Amino acid sequence: ERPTFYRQELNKTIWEVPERYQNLSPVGSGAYGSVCAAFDTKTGLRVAVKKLSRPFQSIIHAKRTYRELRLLKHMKHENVIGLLDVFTPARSLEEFNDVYLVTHLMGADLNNIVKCQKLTDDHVQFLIYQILRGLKYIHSADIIHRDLKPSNLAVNEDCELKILDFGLARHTDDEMTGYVATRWYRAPEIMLNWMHYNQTVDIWSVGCIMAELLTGRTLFPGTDHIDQLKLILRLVGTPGAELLKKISSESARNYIQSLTQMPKMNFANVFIGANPLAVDLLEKMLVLDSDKRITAAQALAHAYFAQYHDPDDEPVADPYDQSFESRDLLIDEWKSLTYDEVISFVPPPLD
Ligand SMILES: Nc1ncccc1OCc1ccccc1
């Protein structure tokens, strides 16, 4: 039942993994955590294996670990990263200390691929279609990604795309500061914390990505939070009184009102030469009032995607119980929860 493990040291650390995984080779330069590429001899799949660092060192870290495992176990969709395997060399709860996770090896992300360059309209159609397809799935389970950007989108030779690296740990203030890609795709309401946010923040990110694929340029490359807000408001216009009401921070509401009023620009003269159907879709995504943005399910039926739309093949997710987020537990309790999820894991059918 229990497989045989073997040990080796790599650039760093003792890795201890089932024999099925061969040819471990350090990847990412540690940008993704401690990650090795490998070949899984049981599936024939090229895989990424992550060893979690100090998963249970604190309450906050124990919960993070549990959170990532729960989320990865839930997701089963062509356009979303899933879990191939999860293991520990530990034989009991008492000795449980390390957690390893296994997924498809991704090669190129959309960032380091389309760096500084425009795509053809049919490629924009197909890439945005798949993002919205994965997002309909994610949103139907009441999961919000929260951090969509080109670097979290993986694409292979045949233009096939998966969404990766969900928002699982809140960013520091410093990484959100200045002229940084980490902030350029973020909805204004969450960038300035105007109000309680919801899944519609992801649709704002999609519009920012779509614009960039059409022009080859960052849509809102702000030098800081406030510079970025000015770039946004110049395009979509300053808030009307209806939206101002919904901003529950008095200080933010007050700052917005200090600004000279501006009308929404003509998108056809911004995105010169673009498919009129693409322009129409951009206007429906890039709307300041989040209540009024188009949803993923609605966008999928938009005429821009007539080439790819298939209502019988755009599935939704099983319900996802997130009650644990409200829950306050000891380190050892989070750890015991995690062990149960490791132990109960069943791999996906190879078909
Ligand atoms: N899939 C990957 N491809 C290349 C480098 C890193 C990758 O993912 C790291 C990972 C593995 C397991 C769970 C979560 C993240």
Side-chain angles (χ1 to χ4, degrees):
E1 182 137 56
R2 169 200 160 75
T4 296
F5 291 70
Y6 72 110
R7 303 182 184 183
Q8 77 184 78
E9 186 179 303
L10 303 180
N11 286 182
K12 165 180 169 289
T13 278
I14 311 300
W15 292 60
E16 177 156 34
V17 312
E19 302 185 289
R20 61 185 289 177
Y21 300 107
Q22 291 292 310
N23 299 160
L24 281 56
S25 172
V27 68
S29 298
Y32 299 111
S34 191
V35 177
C36 284
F39 183 79
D40 178 22
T41 57
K42 277 194 179 181
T43 60
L45 294 170
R46 294 163 62 174
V47 296
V49 184
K50 181 167 61 177
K51 184 187 180 186
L52 294 186
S53 55
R54 292 191 282 284
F56 309 117
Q57 74 181 307
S58 73
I59 294 184
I60 302 179
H61 283 287
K63 187 173 182 180
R64 288 201 200 304
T65 299
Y66 181 69
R67 179 190 293 117
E68 170 171 39
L69 184 55
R70 284 293 305 284
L71 188 73
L72 269 34
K73 289 186 56 174
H74 192 78
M75 285 166 161
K76 298 175 176 171
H77 182 105
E78 306 183 302
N79 297 123
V80 182
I81 191 68
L83 190 56
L84 289 173
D85 189 25
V86 51
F87 64 79
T88 181
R91 293 171 177 287
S92 67
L93 182 59
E94 295 60 52
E95 52 178 292
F96 181 47
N97 292 300
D98 293 298
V99 181
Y100 297 76
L101 304 169
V102 186
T103 61
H104 294 286
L105 188 58
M106 303 312 287
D109 67 49
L110 203 49
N111 174 61
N112 60 195
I113 282 301
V114 306
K115 226 147 186 172
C116 299
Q117 43 212 173
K118 303 170 56 180
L119 309 178
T120 70
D121 189 59
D122 173 66
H123 273 116
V124 178
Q125 282 172 41
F126 185 47
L127 291 173
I128 304 298
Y129 173 76
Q130 304 173 75
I131 294 172
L132 293 173
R133 187 171 176 263
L135 220 52
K136 180 193 182 189
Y137 177 91
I138 296 170
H139 292 174
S140 64
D142 295 313
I143 296 171
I144 305 172
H145 188 291
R146 195 171 313 110
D147 188 41
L148 282 181
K149 57 197 176 180
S151 64
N152 296 318
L153 296 174
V155 182
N156 64 38
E157 189 65 58
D158 301 309
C159 301
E160 304 181 306
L161 174 158
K162 296 185 190 302
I163 301 172
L164 316 172
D165 299 321
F166 290 61
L168 293 166
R170 303 223 285 290
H171 285 73
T172 69
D173 295 317
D174 187 70
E175 44 194 41
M176 297 300 290
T177 297
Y179 188 72
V180 298
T182 57
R183 198 192 60 246
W184 297 334
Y185 307 81
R186 309 269 293 192
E189 68 264 25
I190 182 171
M191 180 177 82
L192 288 330
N193 186 188
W194 288 343
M195 59 187 88
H196 293 303
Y197 66 74
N198 56 52
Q199 55 186 52
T200 61
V201 301
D202 290 326
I203 298 295
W204 179 277
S205 301
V206 174
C208 289
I209 294 169
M210 187 174 155
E212 198 177 321
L213 300 180
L214 294 159
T215 65
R217 303 299 164 194
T218 320
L219 183 58
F220 301 122
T223 60
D224 60 72
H225 291 61
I226 293 305
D227 184 67
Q228 191 176 322
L229 176 63
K230 297 177 182 176
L231 298 180
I232 296 175
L233 304 183
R234 188 176 62 200
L235 183 62
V236 311
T238 49
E242 193 180 309
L243 182 280
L244 284 172
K245 246 195 171 187
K246 306 181 182 180
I247 300 181
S248 51
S249 171
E250 189 194 308
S251 185
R253 193 172 61 240
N254 182 77
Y255 170 64
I256 289 173
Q257 282 176 285
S258 65
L259 276 24
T260 296
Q261 296 178 70
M262 297 181 281
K264 170 189 172 300
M265 289 179 92
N266 181 313
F267 276 39
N269 299 325
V270 173
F271 300 104
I272 301 180
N275 189 331
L277 261 19
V279 175
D280 181 72
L281 186 60
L282 286 175
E283 301 185 305
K284 294 172 179 172
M285 298 184 296
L286 295 170
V287 175
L288 200 57
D289 188 348
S290 71
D291 297 326
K292 295 185 178 183
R293 298 174 195 153
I294 196 172
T295 67
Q298 299 161 355
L300 288 161
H302 186 279
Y304 186 60
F305 302 115
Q307 168 89 301
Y308 301 105
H309 182 218
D310 182 352
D312 295 312
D313 188 38
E314 302 173 339
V316 300
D318 293 334
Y320 178 63
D321 187 314
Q322 300 185 62
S323 66
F324 74 90
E325 294 284 13
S326 297
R327 197 151 287 145
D328 198 71
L329 305 177
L330 302 173
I331 294 186
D332 279 352
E333 301 177 316
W334 287 124
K335 181 184 213 178
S336 182
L337 262 31
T338 303
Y339 190 64
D340 291 325
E341 295 292 337
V342 174
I343 262 62
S344 62
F345 178 78
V346 179
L350 193 74
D351 193 63

